[PDB]
A paper describes a structure:
MP analysis of [name] alone (i.e., 37.5 nM) resulted in detection of a monomer (71 kDa) and a dimer (140 kDa).
Acetyl-CoA synthetase ([name]) generates acetyl-coenzyme A (Ac-CoA) but its excessive activity can deplete ATP and lead to a growth arrest. To prevent this, [name] is regulated through Ac-CoA-dependent feedback inhibition executed by Ac-CoA-dependent acetyltransferases such as AcuA in [name]. AcuA acetylates the catalytic lysine of [name] turning the synthetase inactive. [name] enzymes consists of two consecutively operating modules, a C-terminal domain (CTD) catalyzing the first and a N-terminal domain (NTD) for the second reaction step.
Residue numbers in the entry:
A (entry chain B), B (entry chain A): 5 to 453
Write the structure that this text describes.
Amino acid sequence: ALPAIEGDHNLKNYEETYRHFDWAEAEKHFSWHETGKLNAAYEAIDRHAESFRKNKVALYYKDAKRDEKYTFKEMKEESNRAGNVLRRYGNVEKGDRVFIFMPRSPELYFIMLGAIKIGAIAGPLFEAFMEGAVKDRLENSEAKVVVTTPELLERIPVDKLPHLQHVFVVGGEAESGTNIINYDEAAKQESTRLDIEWMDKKDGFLLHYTSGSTGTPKGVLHVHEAMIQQYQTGKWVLDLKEEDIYWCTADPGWVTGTVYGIFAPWLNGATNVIVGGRFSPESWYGTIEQLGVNVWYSAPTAFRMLMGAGDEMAAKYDLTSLRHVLSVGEPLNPEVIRWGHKVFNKRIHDTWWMTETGSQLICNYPCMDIKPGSMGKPIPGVEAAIVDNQGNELPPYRMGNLAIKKGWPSMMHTIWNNPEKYESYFMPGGWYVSGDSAYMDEEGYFWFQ
Amino acid sequence: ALPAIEGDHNLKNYEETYRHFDWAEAEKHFSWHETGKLNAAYEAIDRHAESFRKNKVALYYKDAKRDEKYTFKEMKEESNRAGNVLRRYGNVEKGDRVFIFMPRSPELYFIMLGAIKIGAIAGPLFEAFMEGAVKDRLENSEAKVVVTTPELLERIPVDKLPHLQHVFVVGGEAESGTNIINYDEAAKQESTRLDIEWMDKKDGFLLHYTSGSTGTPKGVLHVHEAMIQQYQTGKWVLDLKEEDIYWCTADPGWVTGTVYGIFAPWLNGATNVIVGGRFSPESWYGTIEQLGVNVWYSAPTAFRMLMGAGDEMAAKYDLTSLRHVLSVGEPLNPEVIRWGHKVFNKRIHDTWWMTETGSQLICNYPCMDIKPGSMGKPIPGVEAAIVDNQGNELPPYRMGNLAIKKGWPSMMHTIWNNPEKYESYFMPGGWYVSGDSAYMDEEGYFWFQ
């Protein structure tokens, strides 16, 4: 059991906050509580650009060809420009699905934020998807607009999708066809002021496609209200301060990079770092050393591959700027935890959630001891349990299905065009079952199986 | 008489503060007041880089070839690197004179900050100086180190200066001679951590050379304590908020671009903008529109050339971001005031000071009415008057010599290696005379002649 380290954490004590927390208190930190105008994108970007965080660096893009950095004001301007481009050329209205199919780049974030600002539902696609996956995801969602690069423009079958009107191409000298629009040319002539579509807490703003047990991808829809939890988990689990440099290594194509690489940091007003190109221990360690990254959010595969690079490889670089390390996507091996404590002299914080959950649910905390191999405890305001097939709670140390009490803000609203699968996730008694096996200890800690 | 505009200014009421202000209150905003370790460079840069302003953009640089942005952390790191370079290669110790002879560039600011951090006295030279002026200024100061560029390396007579040991060259493929060190290679191998030389309030940190009435340049020495006034005038006259973009167009070679282009903004933790290349209305208006500059500090000549450009030239660009405009270096023709109020719809704030005064003394304020053509009123904590040749105050509307009561923090400590000229600036009764004629009105406003 790795002991906790004393410090000035956002969550001072877990127990009292868990016993007393109410989501109405979390709703106080947002602008719409005082004004009534609600939008996740506005809360993530434009709220800070109109505050003392206006000139704070929001985004750090490092790539071999280009090295750029943007402030909150510049991010807001680029997002407004992208939203105007989409509204004018793609004819995107509230509720439309805008799919973004490009490698990780500042334009990706600008376009995603602009799409969400104007009321569209943004769906990111992995750059490595072939023709089949792109076809299925564009057909199921009936996506109106796709934004891509010349390299991946050949992987989209425009002729096989009657519901796809416009294709935006960023970069390169792409010839604008009947349904192809060169994004940069349109953007250069657009304004930086956007009339933001004010939304309702039950309207969707993200659409993420997951590989289902039946073999067909399903669209998970998240609503704006999820930002509430996205903010709170950004403060408790990430422990984001004002002086933190935050780096999330997950791709924006997946849910992890979209939630905790875009929204969780920027809702807290943090500084986010994205790095282009493929993985290499040289590039990652050099990025950490040069940018002085304080908060790191990565995946167990990347950490294990880091382990494969050797201890001296890390010892060649200065990693003293790091202060908080977190992992997600796979239940972490405690040997990786020992290696991290041996290299960075830090505890790697394992967190658990799924695409349907919207945000992390069961996590390790800076103020809590970390038991190696354990997922941790549910966040305050969220109730979790180990239940049988009849919805009855099981005593500790008994194997069972990991269930969460229905009703947390970051819950998925539905499964796109498949209500039966949506209702298939819930058990009698208000228990959302995740299909995963876990067991609770006598101390309240959860262990995955 | 241009009326004042209501707003949330730092100086809410001029009269009450002027009647009650004491410099001991101003001393409370600095770290040294509690810690006891005093340095102007630390207060300007490293204090903010260790606060909630760590990731705030400190410097924008823009020219025809480069476009870079630096945060307070990055500025601190570059300054520490430059200080280490100077300490190791130039053998610069406390009290030495380090002269900087280069065009405006991030390297200039890094080198000047690093020199001041290690206790040296920084002296900037105008890029347009020929061999004669550089020779006189390097001989009078007995400067140990000169830092320059390959273009201006030919304008320095190394052989004629026995007191010049090292010459640093930044950029270009300069062959390192017996006394020539190429700055970039030395910097690349140096650390970003600097053991800062903690100083005393009466030690000099700036040396500025002015054209004297006798024809020979004289070295005006300013002490660290001046930062106090440099901070206060940065808050009252500049009206710097947290969300202000500050642009000073004066060259760092002169006193104006050093006090109010380096120290006054960064002591307040503001964002400074520097633009390379020659003046052109296209470049200046585009810089204002693109960066959204809020606070502007320029010179009447630069405003007059923008007059010559025409109103239709400015009407093309977006200048709504500007909220405060100030002028210095020459009495301001009030026709320029009407033109500014016509174009930017703003009041141009004229300020008066000299190289010997260290910071502005008599200014217009955001909370005060601006009488066109008047220099304004003395800052709180500074007493000014119109005196005759015998040191007696004159009644309003009578011509006389403009004198300031001796003892303000930003006073020059001495004239370098010439005490007689230093004592020649003061009259009996504690009145420092500036050699300029001005008259007071019945309302306390000063008018230059």
